[PDB]
Amino acid sequence: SIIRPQLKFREKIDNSNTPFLPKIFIKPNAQKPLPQALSKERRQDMFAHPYQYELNHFTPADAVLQKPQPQLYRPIEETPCHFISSLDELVELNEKLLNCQEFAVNLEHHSYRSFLGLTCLMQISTRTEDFIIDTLELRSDMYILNESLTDPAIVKVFHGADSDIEWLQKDFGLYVVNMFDTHQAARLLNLGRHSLDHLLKLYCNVDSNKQYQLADWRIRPLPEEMLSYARDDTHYLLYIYDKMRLEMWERGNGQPVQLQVVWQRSRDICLKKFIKPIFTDESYLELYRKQKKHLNTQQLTAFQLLFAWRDKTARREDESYGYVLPNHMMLKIAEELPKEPQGIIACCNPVPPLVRQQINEMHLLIQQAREMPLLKSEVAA
Ligand SMILES: [Y+3]
Ligand SMILES: [Y+3]
C-alpha cells in the first residue's frame, strides 16, 4: 500500500466549489505586470490567464520558421539521465535550460487517489541529456521553472499538451510560452491519427512499452522500467520536432505556412485555463431515465443523497469518485434501498473502504429515503 503523497504537502489542496485561483505569484518574462492581488504579499482581473497578454502577442522567431537541419537524437545509451528532487537541483536545471535553443517536456499524472488529479512527474529533454523531476517532492518549488517555460526565446516541444497545460497551472502555477505540439503538426501530415508511441516507430523505429499508461506514478522509488518508460517520452521529441518542420517545409513548397499554423494552434492550447469541475446527479438520473430504470420517489432520493454524500466525501478525503463509491454500486444501493447497514455492503463488489468506514452515515441516508412518501402511481406499481 502507498501512503498518500498529499499529506507531506505544505499547503493543503482546495477541493471546494470555490473558483480556481491561479497559484503563480511572481511572473518572469513579463510584458504585463502580474495582478497585485496575486503577489506573495497580498495573498486587472485576478482570475485571468497570467500569461494572457504575452501569449496573444507571441509569434515564433524567423530562426525557427526556416528549413530545419534535423539533429539526430543522442543514442539513449550514451545520454545521461538525471533524477531531480531538491530545489537546489531544480534551480541548477532551470539554469541550464535557460541556455537552450529548445527542450522537450512531458508529465505523468495520477487521478485514482485524488479528487482533481495530481501531477507526479515531469520529464524534460535537451539535445544531450534527459531529466526526471519528482513533482510531488518539489511540488511547491516547481514554479521556479516558469523562468524558462515562459521564455519566448526558447521553444518548448510537447505532444498533445492539452491536459499538460491544465495540470501545470493547476498544480504548480506554471505556464508555457512558445510551444510546438508535435501532435498538432501530425494533424497536418496525415498522422494526427496516431499517438507518440507510433510516431516513435515511424520516425525512430523505437518500440514502445504501454504497460505504464495507467500505472500508479505516485510510487516511490520509481523502478528502472518506469524511469525508462518516462524518459523515452521526451528523448526523441526534439528530433521529431525538426523532422516535422522539415516535412511541413517540403509541402508548403518552400514556405512556413504550415509551421506558423502549428505554432498558432499550439499557442492556443497554452492559453487554456484550468476550471475546477462540478458534477450533478441530474446527469445520471437522465441516463437512468432513458434506460427505463423507473426510480420511485424513494429510490431517486436515496440516489440523490448518495451522490451528495459521495461528492462531499471525495472532496474532504481528496479521493476520486471511483474510489469513494463507483456509480453502479451507488445506483444499486439507491435501488435496493437496504434496510440494514449490512444490506448496503452487499451491493458493493468489492466494498470501498470509505464506504465501510462511513457505513452508518450512509445508513441514515438510505433510512431517510425510505421514509419518503410514495406517489399514488408508485404504490400500486
Ligand atoms: Y510512450
Ligand atoms: Y439534483
Short mmCIF file of C-alpha atoms and ligand atoms in Angstrom, two decimals:
data_model
loop_
_atom_site.label_atom_id
_atom_site.label_comp_id
_atom_site.label_asym_id
_atom_site.label_seq_id
_atom_site.Cartn_x
_atom_site.Cartn_y
_atom_site.Cartn_z
CA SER A 1 0.00 0.00 0.00
CA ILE A 2 1.22 3.53 -0.90
CA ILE A 3 0.94 6.43 1.54
CA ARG A 4 -0.87 9.43 0.07
CA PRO A 5 1.75 11.99 -1.06
CA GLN A 6 -0.70 14.84 -0.31
CA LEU A 7 -0.01 14.52 3.42
CA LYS A 8 3.56 15.82 3.18
CA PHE A 9 2.34 18.76 1.06
CA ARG A 10 2.98 22.01 2.92
CA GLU A 11 -0.14 23.71 1.54
CA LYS A 12 -3.47 21.84 1.69
CA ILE A 13 -5.25 21.33 -1.63
CA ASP A 14 -8.51 23.22 -2.16
CA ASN A 15 -11.33 20.96 -3.39
CA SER A 16 -14.14 23.38 -2.58
CA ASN A 17 -16.64 24.72 -5.12
CA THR A 18 -14.51 27.88 -4.93
CA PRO A 19 -13.30 29.04 -8.37
CA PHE A 20 -9.66 28.12 -9.05
CA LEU A 21 -7.27 30.99 -8.26
CA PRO A 22 -4.00 30.79 -10.27
CA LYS A 23 -1.10 29.85 -7.99
CA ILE A 24 1.56 31.95 -9.73
CA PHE A 25 2.89 34.73 -7.50
CA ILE A 26 5.93 36.07 -9.41
CA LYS A 27 5.74 36.48 -13.20
CA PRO A 28 9.11 36.09 -15.04
CA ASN A 29 9.39 37.09 -18.71
CA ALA A 30 6.57 39.56 -18.17
CA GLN A 31 5.20 42.15 -20.61
CA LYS A 32 2.14 42.87 -18.49
CA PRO A 33 2.64 43.09 -14.71
CA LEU A 34 1.10 40.30 -12.66
CA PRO A 35 -2.02 41.48 -10.75
CA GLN A 36 -1.01 42.84 -7.34
CA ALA A 37 -3.62 40.67 -5.63
CA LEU A 38 -1.60 37.62 -6.67
CA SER A 39 1.69 38.91 -5.27
CA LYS A 40 3.16 36.80 -2.49
CA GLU A 41 2.15 39.58 -0.08
CA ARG A 42 -1.49 40.38 -0.88
CA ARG A 43 -2.28 36.64 -0.60
CA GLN A 44 -6.82 43.97 -13.96
CA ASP A 45 -8.64 40.69 -13.44
CA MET A 46 -7.33 38.18 -10.90
CA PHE A 47 -8.87 35.06 -12.43
CA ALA A 48 -7.29 35.73 -15.81
CA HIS A 49 -4.62 33.70 -17.57
CA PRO A 50 -1.34 35.08 -16.11
CA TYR A 51 0.41 34.96 -19.49
CA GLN A 52 -2.66 36.01 -21.48
CA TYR A 53 -1.02 39.16 -22.86
CA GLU A 54 2.32 37.59 -23.78
CA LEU A 55 0.61 34.59 -25.36
CA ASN A 56 -1.72 36.63 -27.58
CA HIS A 57 1.26 38.73 -28.68
CA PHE A 58 3.57 35.82 -29.50
CA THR A 59 4.99 34.74 -32.85
CA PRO A 60 7.84 32.26 -33.48
CA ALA A 61 11.20 33.77 -34.49
CA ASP A 62 12.41 33.61 -38.09
CA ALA A 63 15.20 31.30 -36.93
CA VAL A 64 12.70 28.51 -36.26
CA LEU A 65 10.42 29.15 -39.25
CA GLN A 66 13.27 28.37 -41.66
CA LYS A 67 14.02 24.91 -43.08
CA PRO A 68 15.49 22.86 -40.20
CA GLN A 69 18.60 20.73 -40.35
CA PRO A 70 17.39 17.75 -38.26
CA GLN A 71 19.66 16.95 -35.35
CA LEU A 72 19.58 13.25 -34.53
CA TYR A 73 18.58 12.22 -31.05
CA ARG A 74 21.56 11.16 -28.97
CA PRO A 75 21.89 7.38 -28.54
CA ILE A 76 19.79 6.60 -25.48
CA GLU A 77 22.66 4.53 -24.04
CA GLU A 78 25.06 7.47 -24.26
CA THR A 79 22.56 10.00 -22.98
CA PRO A 80 22.95 10.93 -19.28
CA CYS A 81 19.86 10.65 -17.07
CA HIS A 82 19.24 12.95 -14.11
CA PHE A 83 16.84 12.48 -11.18
CA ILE A 84 15.80 15.85 -9.72
CA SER A 85 14.05 16.08 -6.34
CA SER A 86 15.56 19.05 -4.46
CA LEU A 87 15.12 22.79 -5.11
CA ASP A 88 18.88 23.21 -5.40
CA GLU A 89 18.89 20.61 -8.18
CA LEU A 90 15.80 22.10 -9.84
CA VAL A 91 17.40 25.54 -9.84
CA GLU A 92 20.52 24.21 -11.50
CA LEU A 93 18.46 22.53 -14.25
CA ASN A 94 16.39 25.65 -14.93
CA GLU A 95 19.67 27.48 -15.29
CA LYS A 96 20.88 25.02 -17.92
CA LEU A 97 17.53 25.13 -19.70
CA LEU A 98 17.71 28.93 -19.90
CA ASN A 99 20.69 28.46 -22.22
CA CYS A 100 18.84 26.13 -24.59
CA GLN A 101 17.66 26.61 -28.13
CA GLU A 102 14.75 24.34 -27.22
CA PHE A 103 13.79 21.41 -24.98
CA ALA A 104 11.13 18.67 -24.61
CA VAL A 105 8.54 18.32 -21.83
CA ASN A 106 6.01 15.71 -20.66
CA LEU A 107 4.24 14.87 -17.40
CA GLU A 108 2.99 11.79 -15.61
CA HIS A 109 -0.39 12.29 -13.93
CA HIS A 110 -2.49 10.38 -11.41
CA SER A 111 -6.21 10.51 -10.63
CA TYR A 112 -7.46 7.40 -8.88
CA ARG A 113 -6.49 8.53 -5.36
CA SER A 114 -7.08 12.24 -5.94
CA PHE A 115 -10.14 14.41 -6.39
CA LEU A 116 -9.00 16.87 -9.09
CA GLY A 117 -5.97 14.90 -10.21
CA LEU A 118 -2.28 15.08 -9.33
CA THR A 119 0.94 15.52 -11.38
CA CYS A 120 3.57 13.07 -10.12
CA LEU A 121 6.43 13.54 -12.52
CA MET A 122 7.86 15.85 -15.17
CA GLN A 123 10.21 14.85 -17.97
CA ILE A 124 12.48 17.30 -19.73
CA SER A 125 14.91 16.53 -22.52
CA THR A 126 17.59 18.76 -24.01
CA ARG A 127 19.57 17.85 -27.13
CA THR A 128 22.04 15.91 -24.96
CA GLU A 129 20.51 14.99 -21.58
CA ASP A 130 17.33 13.62 -20.01
CA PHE A 131 15.82 14.79 -16.73
CA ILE A 132 13.16 13.37 -14.45
CA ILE A 133 11.68 15.77 -11.90
CA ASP A 134 9.81 14.49 -8.84
CA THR A 135 6.86 16.90 -8.85
CA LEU A 136 5.47 15.51 -5.62
CA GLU A 137 8.58 16.40 -3.65
CA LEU A 138 9.24 19.68 -5.48
CA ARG A 139 5.52 20.49 -5.71
CA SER A 140 5.87 23.93 -4.12
CA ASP A 141 9.20 24.74 -5.76
CA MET A 142 8.13 23.85 -9.31
CA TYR A 143 7.09 27.41 -10.15
CA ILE A 144 10.75 28.42 -10.50
CA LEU A 145 10.59 26.69 -13.91
CA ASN A 146 8.30 29.45 -15.16
CA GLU A 147 11.53 31.33 -15.99
CA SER A 148 12.19 29.02 -18.96
CA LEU A 149 8.70 27.71 -19.70
CA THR A 150 7.58 31.29 -20.37
CA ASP A 151 10.75 32.41 -22.12
CA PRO A 152 9.64 33.17 -25.72
CA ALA A 153 13.24 32.73 -26.81
CA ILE A 154 13.21 29.01 -26.04
CA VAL A 155 10.87 26.59 -27.81
CA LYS A 156 9.06 24.08 -25.62
CA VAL A 157 8.16 20.86 -27.50
CA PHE A 158 5.23 18.71 -26.30
CA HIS A 159 2.98 16.08 -27.86
CA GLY A 160 -0.67 16.68 -27.08
CA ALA A 161 -0.16 19.25 -24.35
CA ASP A 162 -3.89 19.76 -23.94
CA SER A 163 -4.08 18.34 -20.42
CA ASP A 164 -0.44 19.02 -19.56
CA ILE A 165 -1.18 22.73 -19.88
CA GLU A 166 -4.01 22.39 -17.39
CA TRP A 167 -2.14 20.31 -14.82
CA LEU A 168 0.91 22.54 -14.92
CA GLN A 169 -1.08 25.61 -13.89
CA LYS A 170 -3.43 23.73 -11.54
CA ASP A 171 -0.62 22.04 -9.63
CA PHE A 172 2.40 24.31 -9.81
CA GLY A 173 1.10 27.61 -11.13
CA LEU A 174 3.28 27.06 -14.22
CA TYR A 175 2.55 28.26 -17.76
CA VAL A 176 4.13 27.94 -21.19
CA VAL A 177 5.09 30.45 -23.90
CA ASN A 178 6.46 29.35 -27.31
CA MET A 179 5.21 25.78 -27.64
CA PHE A 180 5.35 23.32 -30.54
CA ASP A 181 2.89 20.44 -30.21
CA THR A 182 4.12 17.54 -32.36
CA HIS A 183 0.59 16.21 -32.24
CA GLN A 184 -0.60 19.37 -33.97
CA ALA A 185 1.98 19.07 -36.73
CA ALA A 186 1.00 15.41 -37.06
CA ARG A 187 -2.52 16.54 -37.97
CA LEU A 188 -1.02 18.44 -40.90
CA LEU A 189 0.90 15.37 -42.08
CA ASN A 190 -1.86 12.76 -42.02
CA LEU A 191 -0.59 11.35 -38.72
CA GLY A 192 -2.78 13.22 -36.23
CA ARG A 193 -4.40 9.79 -36.19
CA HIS A 194 -1.74 8.03 -34.12
CA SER A 195 -0.06 8.57 -30.77
CA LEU A 196 3.53 9.48 -29.99
CA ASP A 197 4.17 5.77 -29.48
CA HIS A 198 3.53 5.20 -33.16
CA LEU A 199 5.45 8.31 -34.21
CA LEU A 200 8.40 6.83 -32.33
CA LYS A 201 8.28 3.87 -34.69
CA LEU A 202 7.74 5.67 -37.99
CA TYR A 203 10.37 8.27 -37.05
CA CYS A 204 12.92 6.46 -34.89
CA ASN A 205 11.99 2.79 -35.19
CA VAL A 206 11.70 2.56 -31.41
CA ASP A 207 9.36 0.06 -29.77
CA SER A 208 7.14 1.45 -27.04
CA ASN A 209 6.02 -0.13 -23.79
CA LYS A 210 2.40 0.68 -22.88
CA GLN A 211 2.26 -1.17 -19.57
CA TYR A 212 2.56 2.12 -17.69
CA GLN A 213 -0.02 4.43 -19.27
CA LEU A 214 -2.31 3.68 -16.31
CA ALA A 215 0.21 2.75 -13.62
CA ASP A 216 0.50 4.45 -10.21
CA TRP A 217 3.04 7.25 -10.70
CA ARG A 218 2.88 8.27 -7.06
CA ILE A 219 5.02 5.21 -6.34
CA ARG A 220 8.47 5.68 -4.85
CA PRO A 221 11.02 4.57 -5.63
CA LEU A 222 10.30 4.59 -9.37
CA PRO A 223 11.74 1.37 -10.79
CA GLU A 224 14.07 1.44 -13.80
CA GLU A 225 11.33 0.12 -16.10
CA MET A 226 9.22 3.20 -15.26
CA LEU A 227 12.08 5.71 -15.38
CA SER A 228 12.86 4.37 -18.84
CA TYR A 229 9.19 4.45 -19.86
CA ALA A 230 9.07 8.13 -18.86
CA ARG A 231 12.28 9.41 -20.40
CA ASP A 232 11.50 7.75 -23.71
CA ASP A 233 8.59 10.19 -23.99
CA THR A 234 10.77 13.32 -24.33
CA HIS A 235 14.09 11.90 -25.56
CA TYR A 236 13.28 11.68 -29.27
CA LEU A 237 10.84 14.58 -29.20
CA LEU A 238 13.25 17.27 -30.44
CA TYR A 239 14.26 15.11 -33.41
CA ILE A 240 10.61 14.65 -34.35
CA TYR A 241 10.24 18.40 -33.90
CA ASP A 242 12.91 19.08 -36.55
CA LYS A 243 11.84 16.26 -38.83
CA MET A 244 8.25 17.53 -38.85
CA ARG A 245 9.27 21.11 -39.64
CA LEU A 246 11.37 19.66 -42.46
CA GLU A 247 8.40 17.75 -43.87
CA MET A 248 6.00 20.68 -43.47
CA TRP A 249 8.51 22.79 -45.33
CA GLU A 250 8.77 20.31 -48.21
CA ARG A 251 4.99 20.57 -48.53
CA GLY A 252 4.29 24.30 -48.45
CA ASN A 253 6.61 24.43 -51.48
CA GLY A 254 9.36 26.16 -49.52
CA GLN A 255 7.32 28.17 -47.04
CA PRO A 256 6.41 28.45 -43.33
CA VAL A 257 2.63 28.44 -43.95
CA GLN A 258 2.03 25.23 -42.05
CA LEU A 259 4.72 25.88 -39.45
CA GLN A 260 3.02 29.08 -38.30
CA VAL A 261 -0.27 27.19 -38.08
CA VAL A 262 1.16 24.57 -35.72
CA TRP A 263 2.70 27.33 -33.60
CA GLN A 264 -0.59 29.19 -33.62
CA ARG A 265 -2.63 26.09 -32.74
CA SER A 266 -0.10 25.30 -30.01
CA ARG A 267 -0.17 28.83 -28.58
CA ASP A 268 -3.94 28.48 -28.25
CA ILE A 269 -3.55 25.24 -26.32
CA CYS A 270 -1.23 27.14 -23.97
CA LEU A 271 -3.98 29.75 -23.45
CA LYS A 272 -6.33 27.25 -21.88
CA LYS A 273 -7.27 27.90 -18.24
CA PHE A 274 -7.95 25.26 -15.60
CA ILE A 275 -11.51 25.17 -14.23
CA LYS A 276 -12.50 23.21 -11.12
CA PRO A 277 -15.22 20.76 -12.11
CA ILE A 278 -18.77 20.37 -10.77
CA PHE A 279 -20.85 17.21 -11.05
CA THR A 280 -24.61 16.90 -10.63
CA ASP A 281 -26.84 13.87 -10.16
CA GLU A 282 -29.11 15.29 -12.87
CA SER A 283 -26.65 13.84 -15.40
CA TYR A 284 -27.07 10.23 -14.24
CA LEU A 285 -30.80 10.49 -13.41
CA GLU A 286 -31.12 11.48 -17.08
CA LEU A 287 -29.34 8.36 -18.35
CA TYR A 288 -31.10 6.07 -15.87
CA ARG A 289 -34.32 7.62 -17.17
CA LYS A 290 -33.60 6.56 -20.75
CA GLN A 291 -32.60 3.07 -19.58
CA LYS A 292 -36.20 2.77 -18.36
CA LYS A 293 -34.90 2.33 -14.80
CA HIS A 294 -38.09 3.74 -13.26
CA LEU A 295 -36.77 5.01 -9.92
CA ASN A 296 -39.51 5.96 -7.45
CA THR A 297 -39.57 8.90 -5.07
CA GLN A 298 -37.67 6.81 -2.52
CA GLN A 299 -35.02 5.41 -4.90
CA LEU A 300 -34.47 8.79 -6.54
CA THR A 301 -33.95 10.36 -3.11
CA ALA A 302 -31.57 7.60 -1.98
CA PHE A 303 -29.54 8.20 -5.12
CA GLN A 304 -29.70 11.98 -4.62
CA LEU A 305 -28.27 11.76 -1.09
CA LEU A 306 -25.68 9.14 -2.03
CA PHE A 307 -24.48 11.31 -4.93
CA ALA A 308 -24.34 14.18 -2.43
CA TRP A 309 -22.60 12.07 0.23
CA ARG A 310 -20.01 10.99 -2.32
CA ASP A 311 -19.15 14.43 -3.70
CA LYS A 312 -18.68 15.58 -0.12
CA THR A 313 -16.51 12.64 0.91
CA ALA A 314 -14.43 12.75 -2.26
CA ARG A 315 -13.55 16.42 -1.67
CA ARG A 316 -12.80 16.10 2.03
CA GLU A 317 -10.66 12.98 1.67
CA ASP A 318 -9.29 14.16 -1.67
CA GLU A 319 -10.11 10.92 -3.48
CA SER A 320 -11.77 10.27 -6.85
CA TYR A 321 -15.43 9.37 -7.26
CA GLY A 322 -14.49 5.87 -8.37
CA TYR A 323 -12.67 5.29 -5.10
CA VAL A 324 -15.27 6.53 -2.65
CA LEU A 325 -18.18 4.81 -4.40
CA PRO A 326 -18.43 3.84 -8.08
CA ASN A 327 -21.66 4.68 -9.94
CA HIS A 328 -23.05 1.18 -10.44
CA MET A 329 -22.73 0.45 -6.72
CA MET A 330 -24.29 3.80 -5.82
CA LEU A 331 -27.06 3.14 -8.32
CA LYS A 332 -27.52 -0.36 -6.95
CA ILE A 333 -27.85 0.84 -3.36
CA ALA A 334 -30.31 3.50 -4.46
CA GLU A 335 -32.44 0.74 -5.98
CA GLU A 336 -32.27 -1.90 -3.23
CA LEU A 337 -32.92 0.71 -0.52
CA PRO A 338 -31.25 -1.63 2.05
CA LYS A 339 -32.96 -1.64 5.44
CA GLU A 340 -29.79 -2.55 7.37
CA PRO A 341 -26.24 -1.20 7.14
CA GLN A 342 -25.09 -4.69 6.19
CA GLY A 343 -27.58 -4.58 3.34
CA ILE A 344 -25.62 -1.74 1.76
CA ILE A 345 -22.29 -3.56 1.95
CA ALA A 346 -23.95 -6.35 -0.06
CA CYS A 347 -24.42 -4.11 -3.10
CA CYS A 348 -20.69 -3.42 -3.27
CA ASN A 349 -18.35 -5.75 -5.19
CA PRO A 350 -15.85 -5.10 -3.74
CA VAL A 351 -16.57 -2.83 -0.78
CA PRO A 352 -14.73 0.52 -0.99
CA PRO A 353 -13.04 1.41 2.35
CA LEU A 354 -14.59 4.87 2.75
CA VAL A 355 -17.99 3.18 2.46
CA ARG A 356 -17.27 0.63 5.14
CA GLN A 357 -15.79 3.47 7.21
CA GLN A 358 -18.98 5.55 6.89
CA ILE A 359 -21.40 2.65 6.67
CA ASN A 360 -23.52 4.23 9.41
CA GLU A 361 -23.50 7.74 7.91
CA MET A 362 -24.77 6.16 4.69
CA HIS A 363 -27.32 4.02 6.53
CA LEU A 364 -29.03 7.08 7.95
CA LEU A 365 -29.26 8.49 4.42
CA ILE A 366 -30.91 5.42 2.92
CA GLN A 367 -33.10 5.30 6.01
CA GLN A 368 -34.28 8.88 5.34
CA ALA A 369 -35.04 7.95 1.73
CA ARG A 370 -37.24 5.04 2.82
CA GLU A 371 -39.34 7.44 4.87
CA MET A 372 -40.14 9.48 1.79
CA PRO A 373 -43.81 9.47 0.73
CA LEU A 374 -44.52 7.43 -2.42
CA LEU A 375 -46.74 8.89 -5.15
CA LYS A 376 -50.00 7.00 -5.75
CA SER A 377 -48.86 5.55 -9.08
CA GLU A 378 -45.74 4.21 -7.35
CA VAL A 379 -47.59 2.44 -4.53
CA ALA A 380 -49.72 0.23 -6.76
CA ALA A 381 -46.90 -0.05 -9.32
Y Y B 1 5.50 6.31 -24.62
Y Y B 2 -30.31 17.41 -8.34
#
